[PDB]
Design a protein around this ligand. Structure first.
Ligand code: HEM
Length: 181
Protein backbone atom coordinates (compact mmCIF):
# COMPACT_ATOMS: atom_id res chain seq x y z
CA UNK A 1 0.00 0.00 0.00
CA UNK A 2 3.14 2.16 -0.15
CA UNK A 3 5.54 2.45 -3.11
CA UNK A 4 5.66 -0.96 -4.77
CA UNK A 5 9.10 -0.30 -6.27
CA UNK A 6 10.48 0.85 -2.92
CA UNK A 7 8.85 -2.16 -1.25
CA UNK A 8 10.82 -4.66 -3.36
CA UNK A 9 13.98 -2.59 -2.89
CA UNK A 10 13.80 -2.42 0.90
CA UNK A 11 13.97 -6.22 0.67
CA UNK A 12 17.20 -6.05 -1.30
CA UNK A 13 19.13 -3.65 0.92
CA UNK A 14 17.93 -5.49 4.02
CA UNK A 15 19.73 -8.51 2.56
CA UNK A 16 22.95 -6.52 1.97
CA UNK A 17 23.41 -4.30 5.06
CA UNK A 18 20.09 -4.62 6.95
CA UNK A 19 17.04 -2.44 7.60
CA UNK A 20 19.07 0.14 9.55
CA UNK A 21 20.83 1.25 6.35
CA UNK A 22 17.53 1.57 4.52
CA UNK A 23 15.97 3.67 7.24
CA UNK A 24 19.14 5.74 7.64
CA UNK A 25 19.74 7.03 4.10
CA UNK A 26 15.97 7.06 3.55
CA UNK A 27 15.36 9.51 6.39
CA UNK A 28 18.25 11.65 5.16
CA UNK A 29 17.11 11.78 1.51
CA UNK A 30 13.36 11.52 2.23
CA UNK A 31 11.12 14.62 1.66
CA UNK A 32 8.84 16.35 4.16
CA UNK A 33 6.04 13.82 3.69
CA UNK A 34 8.46 10.92 4.19
CA UNK A 35 6.22 8.39 2.40
CA UNK A 36 6.51 6.25 -0.75
CA UNK A 37 3.25 5.62 -2.63
CA UNK A 38 2.91 3.16 -5.52
CA UNK A 39 -0.26 4.80 -6.83
CA UNK A 40 1.43 8.20 -7.01
CA UNK A 41 4.46 9.25 -9.06
CA UNK A 42 5.82 12.15 -7.03
CA UNK A 43 9.09 12.03 -5.10
CA UNK A 44 9.97 9.28 -7.57
CA UNK A 45 13.33 10.97 -8.14
CA UNK A 46 14.28 9.92 -4.62
CA UNK A 47 14.76 6.41 -6.02
CA UNK A 48 17.68 7.64 -8.12
CA UNK A 49 19.27 9.50 -5.21
CA UNK A 50 18.86 6.31 -3.18
CA UNK A 51 20.39 4.09 -5.86
CA UNK A 52 23.53 6.23 -6.18
CA UNK A 53 23.97 6.67 -2.41
CA UNK A 54 23.20 3.12 -1.34
CA UNK A 55 25.87 2.24 -3.89
CA UNK A 56 28.40 4.46 -2.10
CA UNK A 57 27.98 2.83 1.31
CA UNK A 58 27.57 -0.62 -0.21
CA UNK A 59 30.78 0.23 -2.07
CA UNK A 60 29.42 -0.51 -5.54
CA UNK A 61 29.21 1.41 -8.87
CA UNK A 62 25.82 2.99 -9.57
CA UNK A 63 25.73 1.13 -12.92
CA UNK A 64 25.92 -2.24 -11.12
CA UNK A 65 23.52 -1.26 -8.35
CA UNK A 66 20.82 -0.10 -10.76
CA UNK A 67 21.22 -3.36 -12.67
CA UNK A 68 21.08 -5.70 -9.67
CA UNK A 69 18.14 -3.64 -8.42
CA UNK A 70 16.18 -4.56 -11.55
CA UNK A 71 16.95 -8.29 -11.50
CA UNK A 72 15.47 -8.40 -8.01
CA UNK A 73 12.65 -5.95 -8.73
CA UNK A 74 11.28 -8.41 -11.26
CA UNK A 75 11.42 -11.27 -8.76
CA UNK A 76 9.42 -9.44 -6.08
CA UNK A 77 7.03 -7.86 -8.57
CA UNK A 78 6.15 -11.20 -10.15
CA UNK A 79 5.11 -12.34 -6.68
CA UNK A 80 2.65 -9.42 -6.58
CA UNK A 81 1.51 -9.68 -10.21
CA UNK A 82 2.15 -13.40 -10.67
CA UNK A 83 -1.26 -13.40 -12.38
CA UNK A 84 -0.21 -10.98 -15.10
CA UNK A 85 3.28 -12.39 -15.52
CA UNK A 86 2.18 -16.05 -15.55
CA UNK A 87 0.32 -15.17 -18.77
CA UNK A 88 3.66 -15.71 -20.54
CA UNK A 89 4.30 -19.25 -19.26
CA UNK A 90 7.73 -18.69 -20.96
CA UNK A 91 10.31 -15.88 -21.29
CA UNK A 92 9.60 -15.70 -25.04
CA UNK A 93 5.91 -14.87 -24.57
CA UNK A 94 6.67 -12.14 -22.00
CA UNK A 95 9.35 -10.10 -23.81
CA UNK A 96 6.88 -9.56 -26.67
CA UNK A 97 4.03 -8.98 -24.17
CA UNK A 98 5.87 -6.40 -22.06
CA UNK A 99 4.38 -3.10 -23.23
CA UNK A 100 1.27 -4.99 -24.31
CA UNK A 101 -0.44 -6.60 -21.29
CA UNK A 102 2.16 -6.22 -18.53
CA UNK A 103 2.29 -2.41 -18.84
CA UNK A 104 -1.37 -2.08 -19.82
CA UNK A 105 -2.63 -3.73 -16.62
CA UNK A 106 -0.38 -1.81 -14.22
CA UNK A 107 -1.65 1.40 -15.81
CA UNK A 108 -5.24 0.67 -14.80
CA UNK A 109 -4.16 -0.69 -11.43
CA UNK A 110 -1.82 2.25 -10.82
CA UNK A 111 0.00 5.15 -12.48
CA UNK A 112 -1.41 6.65 -15.68
CA UNK A 113 -0.85 6.34 -19.48
CA UNK A 114 2.80 7.41 -19.41
CA UNK A 115 4.85 4.23 -19.04
CA UNK A 116 8.27 4.02 -20.85
CA UNK A 117 8.33 3.14 -24.57
CA UNK A 118 8.99 -0.56 -25.19
CA UNK A 119 8.48 -2.41 -28.49
CA UNK A 120 9.28 -6.12 -28.55
CA UNK A 121 9.60 -7.71 -31.99
CA UNK A 122 10.23 -11.41 -32.63
CA UNK A 123 13.10 -12.35 -34.97
CA UNK A 124 14.38 -15.71 -36.33
CA UNK A 125 16.85 -18.17 -34.78
CA UNK A 126 15.17 -17.65 -31.39
CA UNK A 127 16.14 -13.96 -31.16
CA UNK A 128 14.05 -11.02 -29.92
CA UNK A 129 14.53 -7.34 -30.78
CA UNK A 130 13.45 -5.14 -27.90
CA UNK A 131 13.43 -1.38 -28.49
CA UNK A 132 13.58 1.03 -25.54
CA UNK A 133 13.27 4.81 -25.22
CA UNK A 134 12.42 7.28 -22.44
CA UNK A 135 13.94 10.49 -20.88
CA UNK A 136 14.46 8.43 -17.72
CA UNK A 137 17.40 7.00 -19.69
CA UNK A 138 17.24 4.34 -16.96
CA UNK A 139 17.66 1.64 -19.61
CA UNK A 140 20.31 0.09 -17.38
CA UNK A 141 17.35 -1.00 -15.24
CA UNK A 142 15.48 -2.57 -18.15
CA UNK A 143 18.42 -4.90 -18.73
CA UNK A 144 18.41 -6.13 -15.14
CA UNK A 145 14.66 -6.76 -15.31
CA UNK A 146 15.09 -8.97 -18.37
CA UNK A 147 17.74 -11.07 -16.59
CA UNK A 148 15.66 -11.31 -13.42
CA UNK A 149 12.74 -12.86 -15.27
CA UNK A 150 15.05 -15.11 -17.29
CA UNK A 151 16.76 -16.60 -14.24
CA UNK A 152 13.47 -16.96 -12.37
CA UNK A 153 12.74 -19.58 -15.07
CA UNK A 154 16.24 -21.10 -15.26
CA UNK A 155 16.48 -19.57 -18.75
CA UNK A 156 19.88 -18.19 -19.79
CA UNK A 157 20.03 -15.33 -22.31
CA UNK A 158 22.34 -12.64 -23.70
CA UNK A 159 21.62 -8.96 -24.40
CA UNK A 160 23.43 -6.80 -26.94
CA UNK A 161 22.93 -3.06 -26.44
CA UNK A 162 24.76 -1.08 -29.15
CA UNK A 163 22.20 1.73 -29.38
CA UNK A 164 21.64 3.75 -26.21
CA UNK A 165 19.88 7.09 -25.81
CA UNK A 166 22.67 7.73 -23.34
CA UNK A 167 25.17 7.95 -26.23
CA UNK A 168 23.33 10.83 -27.91
CA UNK A 169 21.05 8.37 -29.70
CA UNK A 170 17.33 9.18 -29.89
CA UNK A 171 16.44 5.66 -28.77
CA UNK A 172 17.94 2.29 -27.82
CA UNK A 173 18.28 -1.21 -29.30
CA UNK A 174 18.44 -4.32 -27.07
CA UNK A 175 18.69 -7.72 -28.78
CA UNK A 176 17.96 -10.72 -26.54
CA UNK A 177 19.47 -13.92 -27.93
CA UNK A 178 17.94 -17.15 -26.60
CA UNK A 179 20.28 -20.07 -25.89
CA UNK A 180 19.27 -23.49 -27.24
CA UNK A 181 22.08 -25.38 -25.51
C1 HEM B 1 11.31 -7.69 -18.14
C2 HEM B 1 10.05 -7.12 -18.13
C3 HEM B 1 9.88 -5.76 -17.94
C4 HEM B 1 10.49 -4.77 -18.62
C5 HEM B 1 11.61 -4.93 -19.60
C6 HEM B 1 9.97 -3.54 -18.09
C7 HEM B 1 10.61 -2.33 -18.21
C8 HEM B 1 10.27 -1.19 -17.53
C9 HEM B 1 11.20 -0.12 -17.24
C10 HEM B 1 12.63 -0.05 -17.66
C11 HEM B 1 10.58 0.68 -16.35
C12 HEM B 1 11.24 1.61 -15.38
C13 HEM B 1 11.15 3.08 -15.81
C14 HEM B 1 12.07 3.32 -16.98
O1 HEM B 1 11.75 2.84 -18.09
O2 HEM B 1 13.06 4.08 -16.79
C15 HEM B 1 9.22 0.23 -16.30
C16 HEM B 1 8.25 0.83 -15.53
C17 HEM B 1 7.20 0.18 -14.94
N1 HEM B 1 6.93 -1.16 -15.09
FE1 HEM B 1 7.91 -2.46 -16.19
N2 HEM B 1 8.88 -3.76 -17.28
C18 HEM B 1 8.83 -5.13 -17.18
C19 HEM B 1 7.95 -5.81 -16.37
C20 HEM B 1 6.91 -5.24 -15.68
C21 HEM B 1 5.96 -5.98 -14.88
C22 HEM B 1 5.87 -7.45 -14.70
C23 HEM B 1 5.10 -5.07 -14.39
C24 HEM B 1 4.04 -5.34 -13.55
C25 HEM B 1 4.27 -5.81 -12.27
C26 HEM B 1 5.68 -3.78 -14.66
C27 HEM B 1 5.40 -2.65 -13.94
C28 HEM B 1 5.97 -1.42 -14.15
C29 HEM B 1 5.64 -0.23 -13.40
C30 HEM B 1 4.66 -0.13 -12.28
C31 HEM B 1 6.32 0.78 -13.97
C32 HEM B 1 6.06 2.24 -13.78
C33 HEM B 1 7.02 2.86 -12.75
C34 HEM B 1 6.57 4.26 -12.43
O3 HEM B 1 6.34 5.04 -13.39
O4 HEM B 1 6.45 4.57 -11.21
N3 HEM B 1 6.72 -3.88 -15.56
N4 HEM B 1 9.10 -1.04 -16.81
Amino acid sequence: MKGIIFNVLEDMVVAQCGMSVWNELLEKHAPKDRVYVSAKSYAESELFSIVQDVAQRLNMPIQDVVKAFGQFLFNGLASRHTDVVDKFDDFTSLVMGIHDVIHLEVNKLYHEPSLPHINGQLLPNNQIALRYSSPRRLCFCAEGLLFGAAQHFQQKIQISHDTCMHTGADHCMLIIELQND
